[PDB]
Design a protein around this nucleic acid. Structure first.
Lengths: 179, 89, 59, 195, 92, 114, 71, 56, 150, 214, 139, 42
RNA sequence: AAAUUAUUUUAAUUAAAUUAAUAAAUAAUUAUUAAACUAAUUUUAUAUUAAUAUUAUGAAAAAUUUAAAAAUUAAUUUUUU
């Protein structure tokens, strides 16, 4: 049985009187006060600590006439997905932005729709008469829906044109490597 | 036991062509083809020992079947076990 | 009654030897060591399979 | 026939009209237990089905208290002793039966936490006794019309057997139109309890 | 007669029942097997009664001591194949 | 009730009930897994005759739901007879045998042939 | 059968007595069953692991007269 | 692996060089294609220096 | 349209999506056995079991533990975007049979010797490869030698 | 309809009892070219007589269905483990490689069985009855035998139960298999005689008509 | 010990329990299948009988309208004959067995071009994750 | 399963159907409660 | 009776019967070491064993059952790194 003494032997320096002087009472104290922290910390600190954050956002939602009883459920309605630890940062350091979330939920704005499961592109229901040089109607369907989305993300140099960029030639950028 | 007497149903006809139900035994059993197949002491094939190097063909297939590089000698030429007087020893 | 074999007198590359036992016993754990080649869970019938092979190889 | 192997129950044509479950009524053929039936053929309430009795039998009326009433068993009576048996078989089956339960009851009031439904009595009728009924007939007591059964121990509730007036069935059952099905709610932990 | 008194039957052929069970349990999977089988546990009460409708009377019948000891002369004259006077009880 | 240690030793394959159902299925004491239909026949043309002999009842012990009322013609017991005699006669062959019976003989119905 | 009557009746009894803790099939014949105190086929403890695991054929098992040996 | 009769596949952890080495796989595949190009051309002196190269 | 629809009638099974709503450690050893045969142990676990008959009992015994949902197969061929023509007995005929935790053999040893040999037939797959290179070079070294003398 | 082949002496002659749609079709007696491919022709022979017992599974063609039938091209079967047709095992325990394409084994002819494979050096249990001259199957899949008896039987299985995609339109399987001659013909019979069977499978009133040992 | 009463909220959230089970066993007595027709729509409304308190009708902001978008929509494979008209076009690329290469126009196979063990150099990234260790799928 | 008709037509396992009285008995050629309402109901 | 010295690990569990001038001995359990894939199903799910090591007689809350019990007794699911 190994009491990790050399891991506690130098840490009695912050205990109080009798514990620092003697060792077999110094360890016994800290190896308990340590043994209860890491038991308090795993199973008990959160469901206390995460109740200060709830008591904060509540009484900060309470200032605007709403409760936590109504805000906690009117957020998940709007698919808004802000963990309570964050709403407590907004309750304090960004009050206006928080009340923006407040005035949003109370509003009768249609919450976003649930995401649509994957759909069947209707070209799967045609049988391409297989010619070597023509693409399958379901590929040039997928591609155009993947290139229009690559031109969608970020201001770049890629055929930089105002608003929507050039596509009908982007799909045929292989011929530019052809001889 | 009393046997099978007080004979069979005691009917007769030209039809008389629908029954077998041999007493189980007279159906590959008391036609004693091979029940000793399970009840006869085996005569074991040649046994490889530390001293007695008796080869066996039954095992040699389980090597002749394998996909082994470094092929094996044919069995007959692997045998130490086959004209003065019909050929000397 | 749980047995293993030991192939003790071999020289060469045991691995090109042991890679020819695997094709025989695709299910017995075979370990290679400097002098020997241990093959596990194979009893005196496996002893008989080897020599019918070590004779076929010509040794 | 042997003294060891005796028929566990025998066929019987009732002459009188016995109330009990093993009982029958005027002229029906019933396989009632041997020990009971044997003290009927001595008692005269029953007679073994000889070919003669299979047409008529001199049943009994409490009016003159003797075996005068001839009850002839034509095919029509045999459609009457069937519906009248099939009826009072549901009676004597739920009235004899004592249908059990296993339920969860956290708390002090000995109160079943998920109280019983009239669905959950017809369910334990069909489960244990195979008595298939309409759970619209089961009337609960006054204590359990509000919250369902709700309490452990012995509860009972009334099952209404409606169609008993053209069978001429009274005084041979305890109540023509009801029967007391007798619950019992044997509380059990999550191991063996449902709901 | 009395479901309290049981026999132990060993029927010698194991294939005779296995090769039916594997059917009886393959048919009733496709819903094509009938439940009125003799081997059904809850049907045996009715099964006997479809075939032998008065079997109660065939075992309940009490035999007069005359017919139970059929005329010993019918045994010497050979009419009755062999008199059995003690086998009197119908074990069915 | 299956209490007791020996039932513990033999449900689990413990000490010497290590192959417990000492006679499980897949052994036949009687016919040793060889079909009892003679192929050694006088004339080779008539070797196919014995095919399709009943080794037991085949029909009563199984208990199929023959939904055929007993007054149907014989040609409507062919789907049952076949399932035990394939490897002997093609299904469409039976409907040549189970019709010549109806045509030639005076029998028509399942009740008649019984 | 006549050949078996002899091959069984010219065996010294000790070849029949119970002779090993593992009956030729592999079970462990403990006491108390007077039937199993008779071990006709002799057991072989160190033999037979190739069968039933490597796909070795049932043709190898059998002896010279055809009857299988057990392992 | 420290176990032998349960969780013992961890003594025979094998990873094929055709997964954990791609420059080797290609090298095995170039020479395989070089085996069939001489198989058609019937360059038996070359198919060897393909094989005797590949095995080494 | 007031008419029993007329056409060649296909039948579509159902596929149950099962979840676990009550903890397993409160229940019996048999109820835990059913949950094990539905690939369900922990609370919140979720599996997609078929509506075949002997599953219907397993789910039935543990109804008080799970929360089922039924899908007709057409309502499954759309939950994952699937062309109507492709059946499922050809989709599965494509995935390998050695998916994660391939088999469920009778005990964690037989499991650990089903994964062992699976890690052997990899070794042999490269070794049957490395000699098949030699056996072809050897059969050529024979022909180069043989035809050498001609 | 006509079917030639290459007749040989002293080879195993192996038969399937093919069943389709609950209509037992007959018996397809294959021959096995042992003289050319002694390692493969054994693997097939062993799986068709139940001789070699448990390896990874019930090494036995009895029951397993023709998971892949293509009209006019092939009639594939086998795949003993996970019978729905995506595995490949040998009686050896690993998928062995093809031996020879030299001659009589690298010619896929319209009446000839070839041991299909996933990768070139991985031969296993899945065969196919060639239905036509496939000059793009030469040099790749090793021919293991040829169909002696009942070509009309297999030429039917492909019609009733075949679709261009390969997956069958109906059910078809191998209700029985065995060995009817060749080397180790009787020597296998002693390996299968006696009370206790080698393998345990549903009674021959099931495999023959209703269900293919799924 | 069981001393003070079960709080009311618990009994109420346990009356929801028996009314969960009373909703499971409503699912576990449905027919094993559903006799359906090819020509008709897939599920035109065709649910189970689950119109006790019907919800989410809005056809968007409804969970199911990723699915019943396609069910109620006209079924393309409108007949068993149309199925083979559609099922005869799909290939199986990786399945075990032989094939007929020239069935396409001019495609030249891949697995017989880079060998069997070599896989295309998939770009490994967060969103795009290709199969790892391909030499373990050979059973 | 639907290919080999293996799916039963009666919904609910044998043990379940004895437990719940709402799955109606699957008698076919008889009435559930014995004799049909021979008497005119009206 | 009191003790029996080396953290960061890497496969699980209880059992409850034959007997005792009343517990060193046996089952059963646990343990160390090792094993082989027999129809039953899903393409589900499965700790089954051998060989040795073994100073043990009594099971919360239930469900009930003996007993003036005034608990003991039977019971059988728990039994936290």
């Amino acid at each position: 049985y190994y009491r990790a003494t050399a891991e506690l032997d130098r840490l009695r320096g912050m205990l109080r009187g009798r514990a620092r002087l003697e060792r077999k009472v110094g360890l016994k104290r800290i190896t308990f006060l340590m043994r209860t922290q890491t038991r308090y910390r795993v199973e008990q600190k959160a469901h206390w600590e995460r109740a200060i954050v709830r008591k904060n956002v509540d009484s900060a939602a309470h200032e605007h006439g709403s409760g936590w009883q109504h805000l906690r459920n009117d957020l998940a309605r709007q698919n808004l997905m802000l963990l309570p630890r964050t709403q407590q940062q907004l309750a304090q350091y960004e009050p206006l932005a928080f009340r923006a979330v407040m005035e949003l939920c109370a509003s009768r704005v249609a919450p976003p729709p649930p995401p649509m499961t994957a759909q069947v592109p209707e070209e799967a229901y045609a049988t391409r008469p297989e010619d070597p040089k023509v693409a399958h109607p379901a590929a040039r369907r997928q591609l155009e829906e993947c290139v229009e989305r690559m031109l969608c993300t970020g201001r770049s140099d890629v055929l930089q044109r105002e608003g929507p960029r050039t596509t009908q030639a982007w799909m045929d950028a292989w011929k530019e490597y052809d001889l | 036991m009393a046997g099978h007497f007080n004979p069979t149903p005691q009917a007769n006809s030209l039809a008389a062509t629908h029954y077998a139900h041999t007493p189980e035994l007279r159906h590959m059993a008391d036609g004693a083809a091979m029940s000793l197949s399970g009840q006869r002491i085996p005569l074991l094939k040649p046994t490889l020992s530390k001293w007695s190097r008796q080869l066996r063909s039954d095992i040699y297939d389980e090597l002749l079947k394998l996909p082994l590089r470094y092929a094996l000698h044919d069995f007959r030429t692997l045998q130490a076990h086959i004209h003065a007087s019909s050929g000397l020893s | 009654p749980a047995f293993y074999m030991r192939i003790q007198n071999i020289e060469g590359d045991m691995f090109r030897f042991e890679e020819e036992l695997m094709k025989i016993f695709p299910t017995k754990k075979i370990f290679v060591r400097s002098h020997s080649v241990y093959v596990y869970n194979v009893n005196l019938d496996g002893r008989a399979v080897l020599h019918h092979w070590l004779l076929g190889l010509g040794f | 026939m042997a003294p060891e192997l005796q028929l566990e129950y025998i066929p019987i044509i009732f002459t009188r009209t016995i109330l009990g479950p093993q009982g029958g009524f005027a002229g029906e053929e019933r396989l009632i237990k041997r020990e009971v039936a044997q003290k009927y053929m001595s008692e005269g309430n029953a007679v073994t089905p000889s070919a003669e009795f299979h047409q008529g039998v001199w049943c009994y009326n409490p009016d003159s208290e003797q075996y005068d009433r001839f009850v002839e068993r034509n095919a029509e009576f045999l459609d009457f002793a069937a519906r009248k048996r099939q009826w009072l078989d549901v009676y004597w089956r739920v009235n004899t039966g004592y249908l059990l339960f296993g339920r969860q009851s956290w708390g002090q009031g000995w109160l079943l936490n998920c109280p019983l439904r009239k669905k959950d009595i017809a369910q334990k009728l069909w489960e244990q006794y195979k008595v298939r009924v309409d759970p619209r007939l089961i009337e609960f007591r006054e204590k359990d019309r509000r919250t369902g059964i709700q309490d452990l121990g012995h509860n009972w509730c009334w099952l209404y057997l409606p169609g008993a007036e053209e069978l001429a069935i009274d005084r041979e059952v305890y109540d023509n139109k009801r029967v007391k099905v007798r619950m019992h709610i044997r509380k059990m932990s999550s191991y063996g309890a449902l709901y | 007669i009395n479901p309290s008194y049981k026999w132990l039957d060993v029927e010698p052929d194991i294939q005779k029942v296995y090769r039916s069970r594997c059917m009886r349990a393959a048919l009733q999977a496709r819903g094509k097997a009938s439940m009125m089988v003799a081997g059904n546990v809850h049907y045996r009460a009715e099964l006997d009664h479809v075939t032998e409708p008065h079997w109660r009377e065939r075992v309940m019948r009490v035999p007069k001591a005359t017919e139970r000891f059929q005329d010993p002369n019918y045994f010497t004259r050979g009419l009755v194949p062999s008199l059995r006077p003690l086998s009197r009880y119908s074990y069915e | 009730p299956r209490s007791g240690v020996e039932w513990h030793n033999r449900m689990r394959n413990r000490n010497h009930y290590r192959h417990w159902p000492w006679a499980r299925w897949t052994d036949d004491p009687v016919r040793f897994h060889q079909d009892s239909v003679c192929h050694r026949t006088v004339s080779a043309l008539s070797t196919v005759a014995n095919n399709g002999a009943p080794e037991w009842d085949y029909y009563a012990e199984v208990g199929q739901a023959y939904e055929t009322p007993s007054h149907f013609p014989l040609s409507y017991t062919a789907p049952f007879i076949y399932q035990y005699t394939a490897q002997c006669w093609s299904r469409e062959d039976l409907q040549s045998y189970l019709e010549r019976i109806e045509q030639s003989s005076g029998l028509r119905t399942i009740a008649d042939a019984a | 059968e006549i050949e078996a009557l002899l091959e069984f009746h010219a065996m010294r009894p000790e070849k029949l007595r119970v002779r090993a803790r593992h009956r030729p099939d592999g079970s462990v014949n403990m006491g108390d069953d007077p039937n199993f105190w008779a071990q006709a086929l002799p057991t072989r403890a160190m033999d037979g692991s190739m069968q039933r695991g490597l796909g070795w054929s049932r043709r190898t098992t059998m002896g010279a007269n055809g009857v299988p040996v057990v392992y | 692996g420290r176990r032998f009769n349960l969780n013992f596949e961890e003594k025979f952890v094998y990873f094929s060089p055709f997964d954990y080495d791609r420059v080797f796989a290609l090298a095995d595949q170039c020479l395989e294609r070089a085996e069939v190009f001489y198989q058609a051309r019937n360059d038996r002196a070359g198919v060897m220096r393909v094989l005797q190269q590949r095995k080494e | 349209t007031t008419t029993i629809a007329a056409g060649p009638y296909r039948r579509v099974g159902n596929v149950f999506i099962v979840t676990c709503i009550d903890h397993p450690f409160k229940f019996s050893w048999e109820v835990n056995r059913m949950l094990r045969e539905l690939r369900l142990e922990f609370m919140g676990q979720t599996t997609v079991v078929p509506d075949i008959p002997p599953v219907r009992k397993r789910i039935w015994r543990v109804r008080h533990v799970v929360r089922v949902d039924q899908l007709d197969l057409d309502e499954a061929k759309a939950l994952i975007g699937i062309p109507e023509h492709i059946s499922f007995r050809d989709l599965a005929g494509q995935i390998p049979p050695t998916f994660g935790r391939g088999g469920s053999v009778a005990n964690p040893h037989m499991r650990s010797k089903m994964n062992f040999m699976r890690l052997r037939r990899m070794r042999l797959r490269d070794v049957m490869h490395r000699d098949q290179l030699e056996k072809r070079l050897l059969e050529e070294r024979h022909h180069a030698l043989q035809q050498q003398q001609q | 309809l006509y079917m030639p082949y290459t007749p040989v002496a002293t080879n195993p002659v192996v038969y399937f009892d093919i069943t389709a749609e609950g209509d037992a079709l007959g018996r397809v007696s294959v021959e096995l070219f042992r003289d050319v491919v002694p390692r493969t022709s054994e693997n097939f022979r062993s799986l068709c007589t139940g001789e070699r017992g448990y390896g990874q599974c019930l090494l036995y063609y009895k029951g397993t269905p023709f998971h892949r039938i293509i009209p006019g091209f092939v009639m594939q079967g086998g795949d003993i483990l996970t019978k729905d047709g995506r595995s490949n095992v040998s009686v050896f325990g690993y998928p062995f490689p093809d031996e020879s394409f030299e001659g009589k084994a690298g010619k896929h002819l319209p009446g000839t069985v070839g041991m299909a494979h996933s990768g070139p050096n991985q031969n296993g249990s899945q065969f196919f009855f060639n239905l036509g001259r496939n000059e793009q199957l030469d040099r790749k899949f090793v021919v293991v035998g040829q169909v002696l008896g009942g070509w009309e039987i297999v030429n039917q299985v492909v019609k009733l139960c075949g679709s261009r995609c390969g997956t069958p339109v109906s059910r078809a399987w191998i209700s029985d298999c065995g060995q009817s001659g060749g080397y180790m013909a009787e020597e296998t019979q002693e390996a299968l005689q006696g009370e206790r069977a080698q393998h345990v499978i549903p009674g021959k009133e099931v495999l023959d008509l209703i269900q293919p040992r799924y | 010990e069981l001393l003070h009463p079960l709080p009311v909220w618990a009994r109420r959230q346990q009356w929801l329990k028996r009314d969960t089970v009373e909703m499971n066993e409503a699912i576990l007595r449905e027919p094993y299948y559903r006799i359906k027709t090819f020509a008709q729509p897939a599920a035109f409304v065709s649910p189970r009988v689950s119109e006790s308190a019907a919800h989410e009708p809005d056809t968007q902001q409804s969970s199911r309208y990723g699915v019943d978008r396609q069910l109620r929509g006209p079924r393309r494979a409108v007949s068993p004959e149309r199925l083979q008209e559609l099922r005869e076009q799909l290939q199986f690329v990786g399945s075990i067995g032989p094939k007929v290469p020239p069935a396409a126009g001019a495609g030249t196979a891949y697995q017989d071009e880079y060998g069997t063990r070599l896989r295309p150099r998939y770009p490994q990234s967060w969103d795009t994750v290709p199969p790892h260790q391909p030499s373990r799928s050979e059973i | 399963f639907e290919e080999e008709e293996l799916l039963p037509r009666i919904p609910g396992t044998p043990e379940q159907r004895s437990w719940d009285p709402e799955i109606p008995l699957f008698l076919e050629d008889v009435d559930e409660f014995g004799r049909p309402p021979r008497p005119v109901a009206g």
